[PDB]
Design a protein around this nucleic acid. Structure first.
Ligand code: MG
Ligand code: ZN
Lengths: 225, 104, 468, 136, 52
RNA sequence: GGGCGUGUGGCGUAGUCGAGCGCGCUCCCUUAGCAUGGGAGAGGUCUCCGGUUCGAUUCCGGACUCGUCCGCCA
RNA sequence: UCAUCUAGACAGCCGGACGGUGGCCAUGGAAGUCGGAAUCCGCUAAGGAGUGUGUAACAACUCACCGGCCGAAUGAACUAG
């Protein structure tokens, strides 16, 4: 399933949510339908944490997540950090990042094995990503889009990239990430695919205005069947 | 008598409030199934004007589509056709008087 | 509260899937619950749930299903609520719901029906004939998430008795077949999904997913019931004759080869049963379509279609055996298609591909389908060369190379010619020498145990030390 | 703001009246935006309609590309440079006035934002938070 | 659909009235003059406009 | 702002309650030049829409509409 | 100014509200009720060649007329303080 969901009318689910294999994060100011989608589809096996990052309802663009670790900005308060430490399982590691770009979901596009980052990140932050997430890192842009997290949706099975992407960039990124990539649109043609939707190994959640060919492209590239 | 049954059948679907498009798809399915009533009805229906076109055999052979208002009784619909004939005849008579002078 | 009469249905006198006096059908236009029956429902709450279920928007449907589930959960309080009238209405709606695009709708509907059976056991007997086929179709749906939970629940409903589950397949087999016929023959892509709200594609995609489930069910039915072919021959023929099952065998377009694979399994099962041999026309139609599929595989889609290729070749080998390679004879250009298929297939190797190729050779050699020297060898040689240049690149590499060697070695044995022997030695040396790290992968070295006499290999080691 | 607001906004000290020229932060090829109107502003005699951070305004491109000049389009203020108070009581300000171009529903005409944006704007507009590099 | 008898009972209070042409007052169906002072108890009345 | 009139082919323009001509050009023929003429061509929703009529440019109403004219103070 | 009125008036209930005759023209039909004319008898306590609803035309319902209950004034149109 690519599950049709709105955040109070918003068809961008990746902005307000962060979904990994092991956990899920949702914003505190959410509707009953928005919570019920993650509660029904994810089930009781996977914890869902209602969280606020840096005083903001936006959490997907603020944080970058992995099954092994979670990265939070510097502006995240101690109460939010302690609540995430209690609510999250003991396996994941939560570490604050002290870096100027500070919006880790926009900066970092990552999965379990390999990650794409903004080219201009600091070397200490790159080593921190490689340490906490245990993930090999490449500094690359998707056809000149420096915000790889906003302009790519990535999982273990496959990836969706920006629609206006050069084909040469598509095989280059596909060989670099060792996963097949498809250029496509989400939410009735919105270009920002990573902000448009969240995905993991068995679930994808998207906006209600995402059309049927777009949803078919999602389930094909992410192998959710 | 057969026409009345056809009207009732269409009306029942309308009463349910079924989408007009869905109703038409149903008529088509029934024709494949050979429903007699389904066969009689032409596939396009002017539901907006509440008019249904029903094919009627000339002799109990060729079927001629006839517009039937759902609201009116079958007999009443027929009278409306008769009324048109009557009006046409009146017009023709007036025209006949007009023609001789008009030609001059 | 509910108005109108289904007069057209009364004229039709067809109950479709339903045997309880209510027409049950997958398509949206017909089989909808009669308004009078809806009025007859025991409680206002039930009526409201039904109205919501009828409404197109999914969020509303999901909420209604959740409400229905809640009512069933409190069975003791709501036992009065559930009555035959409810069951007749549910049966009509359930059919439409199981074909729903949204998985949650599908899963919830299946869960609800199972709960009803457990709670109302022995009172749903009248309705078992309607409900059981549909429940099973869900348990044989390609998506794992819908199927696995549904099966687990069904087993639990029957008190975890394997025999009961098997019995169900036997008892309602005629009905199960009727469901398959209805999806395959009676339905069309348009009938299943509304045109206004769907594109030409998607409608096709949906139909294909549903039909695939039907085929999987058919395969299961055949396995479970030994005598199914004899008792239901007429029904089986109509389902098989229709091209809809066969249209699934297209690799040019489509999200997955999983559906295509299911069709291949059906053809194989039918051959094992002997139904395909028994009925020539069905077999010929299937065979020709399979040959067409071989052309569809192309360089652009080779990566996508690679897992299914070993299976395709294996089925072909089995079919060839029938009628002394009669399958090739059906199509004038079949040999050309095979040659083309082989050329495209060799470029990308998948695990088990080589064994399939050898199996095809083994079946074909008696009837000389491929020239051993002019045609086959070139295929083999090119293959090893390709394997060597981009071998270590992949992981299966060790297994894939091992396979090539085992297979090629067998092929070579049936030659009695110098060129083949020469090729084997030269290629082996090249494969080991450019290599990558063949020795280093112990498993690879073990799997590729040897290619020549032991003493000579030692002499070559001697040359490497002796070399400049 | 008005239609495309995702939630409400606390009162930020108004810093951009009508006639203000702010930098154009996105990559749409426009250099500056000239504010002619503020969405949702009230009516008072002689009072100029003023904008704050996170507000949607009507603006014209005074300097930039000729297909963007000489027409009115909606814009969103992302940097304010007049100091305002949050409910945790820090007084903060950027060093320039800056906004991006959008449609009336709020999705950005451009694709990337240079420089920081305010969290009071990023929470209120998700597309701005999507294309934003750093949110403070 | 409500019910035929229940539609009759609800329409007895909602639809089977008369309207004064001068002051738009909702009046009894068998009335002869408007009960309001501002129109001067006029006898210009019309039936309330039904559907269908 | 208001009043009043107006509207025909691709362009111009004639019209009784019974859409024609010219021009652009469609073709063909023509000629010692300082190059023309001839013969057949197409083309209208009569601004539009209703009513009337026997049918309406032709009769009437509405709308469009372009052109006109007249309009503040110290 | 017209009418009705203890020989039973006007409101309210209840019952009948009929035959010649589907009166004559005209219509594919129109039988009281699309129209054109005439508009008469019988039985009556009383019932129109019809007041509406009403159907293709019927059928059906209701009327204005007469009757039981009521027992005494009432209805229409108009004028002006
Ligand atoms: Mg002023
Ligand atoms: Zn009044």
């Amino acid at each position: 399933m690519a599950t049709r969901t709105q955040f109070e009318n918003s068809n961008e689910i990746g902005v307000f949510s962060k979904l990994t294999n092991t956990y899920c994060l949702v914003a505190v100011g959410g509707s009953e339908n928005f919570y019920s989608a993650f509660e029904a589809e994810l089930g009781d096996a996977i914890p869902i944490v209602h969280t606020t990052i840096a005083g903001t309802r936006i959490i997907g663009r603020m944080t970058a997540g992995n099954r092994r670790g979670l990265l939070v900005p510097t502006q995240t308060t101690d109460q939010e950090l302690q609540h995430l430490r209690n609510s999250l399982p003991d396996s994941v590691k939560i570490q604050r990042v002290e870096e100027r770009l500070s919006a880790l979901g926009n900066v970092i596009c990552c999965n379990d094995y390999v990650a794409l980052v903004h080219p201009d990140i600091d070397r200490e932050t790159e080593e921190l990503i490689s340490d906490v997430l245990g993930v090999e890192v490449f500094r690359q842009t998707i056809s000149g889009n420096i915000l790889v997290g906003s302009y790519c949706s990535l999982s273990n099975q496959g990836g969706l990239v920006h629609p206006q992407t050069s084909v040469q960039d598509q095989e280059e990124l596909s060989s670099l990430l060792q996963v097949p990539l498809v250029a496509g649109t989400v939410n009735r043609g919105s270009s920002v695919v990573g902000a448009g939707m969240v995905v993991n190994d068995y679930l994808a959640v998207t906006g209600l205005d995402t059309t049927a060919p777009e949803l078919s492209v999602i389930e094909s590239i992410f192998r959710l069947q | 008598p057969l026409i009345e049954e056809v009207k009732l059948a269409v009306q029942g679907l309308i009463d349910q409030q079924m989408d007009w498009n869905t109703i038409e798809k149903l008529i088509k399915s029934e024709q494949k199934k050979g429903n007699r009533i389904a066969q009689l009805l032409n596939l396009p229906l002017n539901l907006k004007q509440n008019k249904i076109s029903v094919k009627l055999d000339l002799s109990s052979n060729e079927k001629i589509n006839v517009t039937i208002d759902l609201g009116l009784s079958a007999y009443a619909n027929a009278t409306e056709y008769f009324n048109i004939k009557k009006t046409s005849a009146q017009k023709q008579k007036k025209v006949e008087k007009n023609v001789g002078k008009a030609m001059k | 509260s509910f108005g109108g009469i289904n007069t057209f249905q009364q004229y039709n006198t067809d109950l479709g899937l339903g045997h309880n006096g209510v027409r049950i059908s997958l398509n949206y236009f017909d089989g909808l619950p009669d308004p009078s029956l809806l009025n007859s429902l025991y409680s206002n709450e039930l009526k409201l749930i039904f109205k919501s279920l009828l409404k197109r928007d999914e969020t509303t449907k999901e909420k209604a299903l959740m409400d229905l589930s809640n009512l069933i959960s409190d069975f003791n309080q709501n036992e009065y609520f559930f009555n035959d009238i409810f069951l007749l209405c549910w049966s009509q709606i359930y059919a439409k719901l199981i074909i729903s695009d949204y998985k949650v709708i599908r899963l919830q509907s299946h869960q609800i029906t199972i709960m009803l059976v457990k709670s109302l056991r022995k009172k749903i007997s009248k309705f078992l004939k309607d409900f059981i086929p549909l429940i099973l179709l869900g348990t044989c749906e390609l998506d794992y998430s819908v199927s696995k939970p549904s099966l687990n629940e069904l087993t639990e409903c029957f008190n975890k008795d394997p025999a009961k589950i098997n019995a169900l397949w036997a008892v309602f087999q005629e009905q199960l077949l009727n469901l398959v016929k209805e999806i395959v023959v009676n339905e069309n892509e348009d009938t299943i999904s509304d045109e206004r709200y769907s594109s030409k594609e998607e409608s096709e995609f949906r139909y294909h997913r549903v039909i695939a489930s039907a085929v999987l069910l058919l395969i299961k039915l055949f396995v479970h019931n030994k005598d199914v072919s004899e008792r239901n021959s007429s029904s089986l023929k109509v389902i098989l004759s229709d091209e809809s099952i066969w249209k699934l065998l297209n690799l040019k377009n489509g999200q997955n080869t999983n559906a295509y694979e299911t069709v291949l399994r059906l053809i194989d099962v039918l051959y094992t049963r002997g139904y395909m041999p028994s009925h020539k026309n069905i077999m010929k139609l299937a065979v020709k379509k399979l040959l067409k599929s071989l052309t569809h595989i192309t360089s652009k889609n080779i990566l996508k279609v690679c897992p299914v290729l070993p299976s395709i070749l294996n089925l072909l080998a089995t079919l060839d055996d029938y009628e002394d390679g009669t399958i090739w004879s059906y199509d004038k250009s079949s040999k050309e298609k095979v040659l083309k298929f082989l050329s495209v297939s060799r470029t990308s190797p998948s695990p088990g591909f080589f064994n399939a190729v050898f199996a095809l050779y083994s079946s074909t050699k008696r009837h000389s389908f491929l020239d051993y020297y002019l045609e086959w060898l070139p295929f083999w040689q090119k293959s090893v060369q390709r394997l060597n240049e981009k071998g270590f690149s992949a992981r299966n590499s060790a297994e894939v190379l091992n396979e090539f060697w085992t297979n090629f070695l067998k092929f070579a044995e049936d030659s009695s010619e110098e060129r083949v022997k020469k090729m084997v030695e030269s290629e082996i040396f090249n494969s080991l020498s450019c290599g990558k790290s063949l020795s280093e992968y112990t498993k690879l070295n073990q799997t590729l145990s040897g290619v020549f006499p032991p003493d000579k290999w030692e002499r070559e080691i001697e040359d490497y030390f002796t070399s400049d | 703001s008005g239609n495309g607001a995702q939630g409400t906004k606390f009162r930020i000290s108004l810093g951009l009246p009508v006639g203000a020229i702010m930098n154009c932060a996105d990559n749409s090829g426009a250099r500056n935006l000239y504010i002619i109107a503020v969405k949702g502003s009230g009516s008072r005699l002689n009072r100029l309609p003023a904008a704050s951070l996170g507000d949607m305004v009507m603006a014209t491109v005074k300097k930039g590309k000729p297909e963007l000049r000489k027409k009115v389009m909606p814009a969103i203020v992302v940097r304010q440079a007049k100091s305002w108070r949050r409910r945790d009581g820090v007084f903060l300000y950027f060093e320039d006035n800056a906004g991006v171009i959008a449609n009336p529903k709020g999705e950005m005409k451009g694709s990337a934002i240079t420089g920081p944006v305010g969290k009071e704007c990023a929470d209120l507009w998700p597309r701005v938070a999507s294309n934003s590099g750093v949110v403070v | 659909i409500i019910e035929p008898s229940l539609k009759a009972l609800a329409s007895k209070y909602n639809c089977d009235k008369s309207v004064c042409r001068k002051c738009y007052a909702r009046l009894p169906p068998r009335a002869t003059n408007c009960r309001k002072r501002k129109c001067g108890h006029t006898n210009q009345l019309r039936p309330k406009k039904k559907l269908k």
